[PDB]
């Protein structure tokens with residue numbers, strides 16, 4: 282037993298990270314087969330970034346302007362192109378450590394692992410979720426641009442995030458691997474703000490099921506509620522609406538514990554109305570919302586990868 | 588900015604994990620050069636484990652009784668010996684993925700990363716601390732024995748934990764890599780209990796410094812306190828005593844923020860006496876104690892490894 286915020290093993294992604302230098306800017310890139318992916322603002326300078334025209338800036342570059350370092354081995358660039366907000370630099374060598382992989386664009390509420398890197402070298406790994414307002418609450422410093430987020434399924438790495446920028450409230454914004462931003466943000470140094478966030482209701486319920494699987498049961502009651510009456514309380518406390526699709530996804534966890542989904546909703550309602558009154562759940566004094574129903578089942582059942 | 592519970596990148600350790608089967612027991616082993624390390628209760632059965640005599644049980648085994656699987660490649664055993672509570676199985680092939688490494692036995696309060704495995708295949712990675720009562724609050728199921736805990740420094744992997752067993756309160760116990768248990772526990776299925784735990788004072792203070800580095804400042808005050816008066820309040824709330832050695836270790840964090848160590852102690856005292864009154868620190872509603880002063884500096888400064 283036990284329950285922890287668990288990331289995927291990161292070895293398959295470590296073997297893909299490289300350093301990309303152009304002018305006075307250094308950031309991280311992702312090396313898969315004979316292409317390196319990185320954020321397009323690597324072609325900017327500390328005065329280009331105020332309002333750049335990237336097409337007009339890229340047509341002024343040559344291949345040899347791009348310095349790509351893989352360990353202490355130099356890869357030279359033989360072509361380049363821009364796709365939305367990412368650069369694709371073609372190099373003369375295929376990465377022999379290329380795993381099986383895919384690019385995927387995720388929905389708000391889904392979770393992923395982040396391998397934070399500086400100068401092409403990995404620093405640490407942690408678990409994140411895409412918030413309803415399309416930011417992520419990460420841990421990023423100068424030079425971390427180009428670090429990626431990912432999920433692993435068997436032997437296949439599904440890449441879903443590349444890091445670009447930090448907003449004034451201390452949260453983070455970036456793109457999928459095809460260079461499209463999550464949210465309304467643009468890669469320009471001008472006023473933008475996150476928009477108000479909300480709590481991911483379906484994930485909170487999944488975490489209450491994890492507590493029961495592990496022996497915490499003090500928060501249950503004998504009451505119940507309808508979906509509509511629950512959603513009327515949820516709106517009041519700034520929670521996202523729960524759909525019937527969400528109810529259906531929580532089926533397996535309901536069947537393993539014997540607690541109907543709408544009975545667990547009546548328990549959340551009482552916790553929202555009464556607080557916790559000095560008690561904890563799975564070592565937490567707040568209601569936690571960055572575990573999906575999938576996350577709970579993998580950790581409480583023991584699925585591996587290869 | 589931001590602050591997360593961050594584990595080390597796990598690729599160097601993934602390349603060392605193998606499967607060890609003997610009789611009806613399967614668990615994980617660690618393959619470094621031409622030796623595989625695993626827990627000695629792999630030679631037991633579901634009735635040997637009640638009160639075994641391991642010396643008398645090992646002298647009844649032959650090399651071919653041990654089945655070692657590395658991927659879908661079979662390593663055969665050519666010798667074996669027992670050291671305290673671990674087996675060392677010598678095999679005819681050296682692991683070509685052996686990193687630079689050391690074995691170390693850690694003190695209570697230190698943190699490490701855990702790579703949880705089943706059947707020799709990694710499942711996930713998370714951060715832990717050795718509690719004052721020599722248990723760890725992990726996430727482990729049947730078959731996870733032999734999974735290891737570790738720290739990384741530059742290119743060197745320092746192994747510090749191997750998992751053996753779970754106690755009735757849901758916490759975990761194990762050994763260093765030379766087979767000596769942390770705590771009073773023994774590898775026998777008999778009544779043992781953890782002993783009362785305490786909160787790791789020096790780590791809580793380090794985490795309050797992390798909050799200030801990141802912009803949280805509502806909990807500070809203009810008061811101060813002596814070391815002895817602080818330790819008199821700490822004992823009351825079941826915190827560990829703070830030594831002058833602890834004060835000295837918190838020097839760099841004090842110098843970067845401009846807040847003297849004993850001023851931060853006066854802030855903790857007020858938080859212990861008054862509670863948080865509905866506010867959070869670094870996204871937490873409890874005082875967090877599994878970040879060392881070293882952990883804070885690496886994440887707030889950006890150190891990598893290679």
Ligand SMILES: *[C@H](O)[C@H](C[C@@H]1CCNC1=O)NC(=O)[C@@H]1[C@@H]2[C@H](CN1C(=O)[C@@H](NC(=O)OC(C)C)C(C)(C)C)C2(C)C
Pocket residue numbers: 308322330421422423424425426427445446447448449453468469470471472473474588
């Ligand atoms: C690339 O490594 C950095 C990573 C940042 C640095 C601090 N934490 C991070 O995550 N990204 C940028 O430098 C990025 C590029 C330049 C300016 N930024 C920012 O992230 C800035 N933020 C910003 O302009 O937000 C506005 C208000 C929407 C800032 C102030 C943090 C440097 C680009 C092209 C956006």
Ligand SMILES: *[C@H](O)[C@H](C[C@@H]1CCNC1=O)NC(=O)[C@@H]1[C@@H]2[C@H](CN1C(=O)[C@@H](NC(=O)OC(C)C)C(C)(C)C)C2(C)C
Pocket residue numbers: 282614628636727728729730731732733751752753754755759774775776777778779780
């Ligand atoms: C080896 O993979 C398992 C891992 C356990 C299983 C559940 N969670 C885990 O961490 N270890 C054992 O099976 C271990 C060996 C047999 C019995 N155990 C236990 O961990 C038992 N606990 C126990 O006897 O604690 C006493 C009360 C001190 C138990 C009941 C969980 C199976 C050995 C040799 C101790």
